[PDB]
């Protein structure tokens, strides 16, 4: 474990209304810097949440998912990635971010879920406020405060909420599986397309689709028709046709339809592989 006494404030990463993530030094005797992820409004439910969460992270080992480091008394500590979540190092180094490149990050994040299904877990979250990034070439998944571990005798978990990433079946049923994984990654490779751009975002795009006089449920009443009458996010400027084409398969209505990322990986590198070689 850790010794809080040794834990030094440095700078805040991130402050939610859930939970907040601090940068810390570590200096036990120069030390290390770390990530410290610490509960805000903490429940019964929030911290028996929040333990489960522990768990799950400790479980999973892969480059493309942030490194578990332990414990403090409740304190969770994980390794500091200097460059911050891929929504300001986008924003930030967009000129410099060729298409190779957002694939490169789109393979490591299909990857990364390909693996997390490996364990039954499915995700809820997947966004690119959610992923992190170590330098410019490596990428992880880095927060887990939504994923559930799979009932044994089902393949889909009901949860009683970031609905513009949400497939049909999450905004009606309440219901999340590795196919509603799989629509959100579409969601992540439109942003990434967009370089994270505030009124190419998937909320902006919404709203004007659906017309900015609804608040609140109403929204996702007509978000719901919206997608059922298969309104759906534009091709992003300068979006090659084929990964548009792996976009609208993600997004598919037919929860069956949607694609593995077993297989999404697999077409990710090849196009990308294609895009290098010239082909
Ligand atoms: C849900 C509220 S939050 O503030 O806890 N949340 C986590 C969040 C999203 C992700 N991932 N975040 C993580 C970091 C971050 N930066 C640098 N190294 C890191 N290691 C582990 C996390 C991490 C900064 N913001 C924002």
Not at 175 to 190: C, I, R, T
Request: aromatic share 10%; hydrophobic share 35%.
């Amino acid at each position: 474990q850790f010794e809080e006494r040794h834990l030094k404030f440095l700078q805040q990463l991130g402050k939610g209304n859930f939970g907040s993530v601090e940068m810390c030094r570590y200096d036990p005797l120069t030390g290390e810097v770390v990530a410290v992820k610490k509960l805000q409004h903490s429940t019964e439910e929030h911290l028996r949440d929040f333990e489960r969460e522990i768990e799950i992270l400790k479980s999973l080992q892969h480059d493309n998912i942030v490194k578990y480091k332990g414990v403090c008394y409740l304190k969770l500590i994980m390794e500091y990635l200097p460059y911050g979540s891929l929504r300001d190092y986008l924003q930030k180094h967009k000129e410099r971010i060729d298409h190779i490149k957002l694939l490169q990050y789109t393979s490591q994040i299909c990857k990364g879920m390909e693996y997390l299904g490996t364990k039954r877990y499915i995700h809820r979250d997947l966004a690119t406020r959610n992923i992190l990034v170590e330098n410019e070439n490596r990428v992880k998944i880095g927060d887990f405060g939504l994923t559930k571990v799979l009932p044994q005798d089902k393949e889909y978990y009901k949860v009683k909420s970031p609905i513009f990433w949400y497939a049909p079946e999450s905004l009606t049923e309440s219901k999340f599986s590795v196919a509603s994984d799989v629509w959100s990654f579409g969601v992540v490779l439109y942003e990434l397309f967009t370089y994270i751009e505030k009124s190419k975002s998937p909320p902006a795009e919404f709203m004007r689709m659906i017309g900015n006089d609804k608040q609140g449920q109403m929204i996702v009443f007509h978000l719901i028709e919206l997608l059922k009458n298969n309104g759906r996010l534009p091709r992003p400027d300068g979006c090659p046709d084929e990964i548009y084409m792996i976009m609208t398969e993600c997004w598919n209505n037919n929860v069956n339809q949607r694609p593995s990322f077993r297989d999404l990986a697999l077409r990710v590198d090849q196009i990308r592989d294609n895009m290098a070689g010239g082909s």
